Amino acid sequence: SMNPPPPETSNPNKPKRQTNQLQYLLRVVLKTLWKHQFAWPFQQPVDAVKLNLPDYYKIIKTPMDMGTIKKRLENNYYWNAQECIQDFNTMFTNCYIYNKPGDDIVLMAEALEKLFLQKINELPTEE
Numbered sequence: 690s691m692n693p694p695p696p697e698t699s700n701p702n703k704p705k706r707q708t709n710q711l712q713y714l715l716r717v718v719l720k721t722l723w724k725h726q727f728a729w730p731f732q733q734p735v736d737a738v739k740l741n742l743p744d745y746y747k748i749i750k751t752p753m754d755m756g757t758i759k760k761r762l763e764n765n766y767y768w769n770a771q772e773c774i775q776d777f778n779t780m781f782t783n784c785y786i787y788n789k790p791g792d793d794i795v796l797m798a799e800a801l802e803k804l805f806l807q808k809i810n811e812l813p814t815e816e
């Protein structure tokens with residue numbers, strides 16, 4: 690069994706900027722979720738090999754996780770807040786698509802997503 694390569698976190702071909710919204714995404718949004726008691730399954734790519742989930746990457750063709758997001762923020766990968774917000778939504782959506790209501794991982798995702806929603810509701814106006 691094999692995992693795919695992780696999503697990229699560096700690409701000199703990609704355009705990027707450092708903005709007040711992206712700073713908020715790191716300092717407020719990512720930090721809040723990262724510290725949460727239920728963050729840990731989401732802090733790195735799903736290891737479908739060790740977890741014995743051989744169909745994971747058959748169903749999830751756009752993997753995303755907060756370790757990748759953290760690196761993207763820290764390594765100034767993004768052009769705008771929407772690109773980052775999309776990554777968070779992909780991560781949550783992947784969990785809901787793969788799993789079933791009431792599963793522990795879904796409950797965990799839902800807790801993180803509640804906080805995500807509240808933080809992004811106060812994303813500052815661009816400077």
Ligand SMILES: COc1cc(OC)c2c(=O)[nH]c(-c3cc(C)c(OCCO)c(C)c3)nc2c1
Binds near residue numbers: 731787788789792794
């Ligand atoms: C340890 O990190 C994870 C991260 C995950 O997603 C971010 C998942 C995930 O999306 N599903 C599961 C997973 C694993 C098993 C063995 C489960 O029991 C029944 C088989 O379907 C369930 C319901 C979910 N484990 C993750 C572990």
Ligand code: NA
Binds near residue numbers: 733734735752753754
């Ligand atoms: Na993943």
